[PDB]
């Protein structure tokens, strides 16, 4: 701008983050526990013990 | 009788060992389509170690399989080593040897027991190897199929379990005979 003259921006932008699209993750061993949180499983174990 | 049961046990041990060695050495486990076939890809028949192209310009050439996330790494290692089918074959061999010894040291009754334990453990190891193989093949190129080597492994598993059952029955009969003879004496 010190040596030329600009116009008002015709397109405003900024820095941003590019990532690879999340894919269907390869199922993990012990993915059969995913429907319930770990805390539920531990409470189940200790309720079994207590009962 | 006892003799025929022992004969069946030894025959089954030999047959299962042979089938499993054949399946391991053989390279006809999986029929699929692969990118590295010189033209989604070309037909291939694979195994545990090497893969061979069929119906292609590079027909008949067989090349070592290029394997390669901690769990994925461990699975790849176990699949590459194929330690579980090999262990199954080794345990079958040792069980057959123990049976042959039982054909000599007729007094020691805790031998035809080790044979049965080894046969059952071999069946379990074969199950594990099959699971590992199937799991590792999958990734994330269709209409794939399994060959006669895979079913040789399955037959080996079935035979091993059967002969383990027979060996345990033999141990039962022998221990019962000895115990009844002793108590009545």
Swiss-Prot record, chain A:
Transmembrane segments: 38-51
Protein induction: Down-regulated in the pyramidal cell layer of CA1 in the hippocampus by global ischemia.
Superkingdom, taxonomy of origin: Eukaryota
Subcellular location: Cell membrane; Postsynaptic cell membrane; Postsynaptic density membrane
Post-translational modification summary for this protein: Palmitoylated. Depalmitoylated upon L-glutamate stimulation. Ubiquitinated by RNF167, leading to its degradation.
Tissue: Detected in forebrain. Detected in dendrites of neuronal cells. Expressed in the pyramidal cell layers of CA1 and CA3 and in the granule cell layer of the dentate gyrus.
Domains: entry comment: The M4 transmembrane segment mediates tetramerization and is required for cell surface expression.
Free-text function comment from the UniProt entry: Ionotropic glutamate receptor that functions as a ligand-gated cation channel, gated by L-glutamate and glutamatergic agonists such as alpha-amino-3-hydroxy-5-methyl-4-isoxazolepropionic acid (AMPA), quisqualic acid, and kainic acid. L-glutamate acts as an excitatory neurotransmitter at many synapses in the central nervous system and plays an important role in fast excitatory synaptic transmission.
Protein family membership: Belongs to the glutamate-gated ion channel (TC 1.A.10.1) family. GRIA2 subfamily.
Further details from the record: The postsynaptic actions of L-glutamate are mediated by a variety of receptors that are named according to their selective agonists. This receptor binds AMPA (quisqualate) > L-glutamate > kainate.
Subunit structure: Homotetramer or heterotetramer of pore-forming glutamate receptor subunits. Tetramers may be formed by the dimerization of dimers. May interact with MPP4. Forms a ternary complex with GRIP1 and CSPG4. Interacts with ATAD1 in an ATP-dependent manner. ATAD1-catalyzed ATP hydrolysis disrupts binding to ATAD1 and to GRIP1 and leads to AMPAR complex disassembly. Interacts with GRIP2. Interacts with GRIP1. Interacts with NSF via its C-terminus. Interacts with CACNG2, PICK1 and GRIP2. Interacts with GRIA1 and SYNDIG1. Part of a complex containing GRIA2, NSF and NAPA and/or NAPB.
Protein name in UniProt: Glutamate receptor 2
Native species: Rattus norvegicus (Rat)
Lineage: Eukaryota, Metazoa, Chordata, Craniata, Vertebrata
Parent-protein residues present: 507 to 557 of 883
Curated annotation (Swiss-Prot), chain B:
Family: Belongs to the PMP-22/EMP/MP20 family. CACNG subfamily.
Quaternary structure, from the entry: Interacts with CACNA1C. Identified in a complex with the L-type calcium channel subunits CACNA1C, CACNA2D1 and either CACNB1 or CACNB2. Acts as an auxiliary subunit for AMPA-selective glutamate receptors (AMPARs). Found in a complex with GRIA1, GRIA2, GRIA3, GRIA4, CNIH2, CNIH3, CACNG2, CACNG3, CACNG4, CACNG5 and CACNG7. Interacts with CNIH2. Found in a complex with GRIA1, GRIA2, GRIA3, GRIA4, DLG4 and CNIH2.
Post-translational modification: Palmitoylated. Probably palmitoylated by ZDHHC3 and ZDHHC7.
Gene coding for it: Cacng8
Organism this protein belongs to: Rattus norvegicus
Function: Regulates the activity of L-type calcium channels that contain CACNA1C as pore-forming subunit. Regulates the trafficking and gating properties of AMPA-selective glutamate receptors (AMPARs). Promotes their targeting to the cell membrane and synapses and modulates their gating properties by slowing their rates of activation, deactivation and desensitization and by mediating their resensitization. Does not show subunit-specific AMPA receptor regulation and regulates all AMPAR subunits. Thought to stabilize the calcium channel in an inactivated (closed) state.
Protein name: Voltage-dependent calcium channel gamma-8 subunit
Record's subcellular location: Cell membrane; Postsynaptic density membrane
Disulfide bonds: none
Sequence intervals crossing the membrane: 4-24, 81-101, 111-131, 152-172
């Amino acid at each position: 701008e010190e040596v030329i003259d600009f116009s008002k921006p015709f397109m405003s932008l900024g820095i941003s983050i590019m990532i690879k699209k999340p894919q269907k993750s390869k199922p993990g061993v012990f993915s059969f526990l995913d429907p319930l949180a770990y805390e539920i499983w531990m409470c189940i174990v200790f309720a079994y013990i207590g009962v | 009788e006892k003799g025929v049961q022992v004969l069946l046990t030894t025959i089954g041990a030999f047959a299962a060992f042979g089938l499993m060695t054949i399946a391991i050495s053989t390279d006809y486990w999986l029929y699929t389509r692969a990118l590295i076939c010189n033209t989604p890809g070309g037909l291939t028949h694979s195994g545990l170690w090497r893969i061979c192209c069929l119906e292609g310009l590079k027909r008949g050439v067989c090349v070592k399989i290029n394997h390669f996330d901690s769990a994925e790494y461990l699975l790849r290692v176990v699949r590459a080593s194929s330690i579980f089918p090999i262990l199954s074959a080794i345990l079958l061999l040792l069980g057959g040897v123990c049976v042959a010894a039982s054909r000599v040291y007729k007094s020691k009754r805790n031998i035809i027991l080790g044979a049965g334990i080894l046969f059952v453990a071999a069946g379990l190891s074969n199950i594990i190897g099959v699971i590992v193989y199937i799991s590792a093949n999958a990734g994330e190129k269709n209409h794939y199929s399994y060959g006669w080597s895979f079913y040789f492994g399955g037959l080996s598993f079935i035979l091993a379990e059967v002969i383990g059952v027979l060996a345990v029955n033999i141990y039962i009969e022998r221990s019962r005979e000895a115990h009844c003879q002793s108590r009545s004496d």
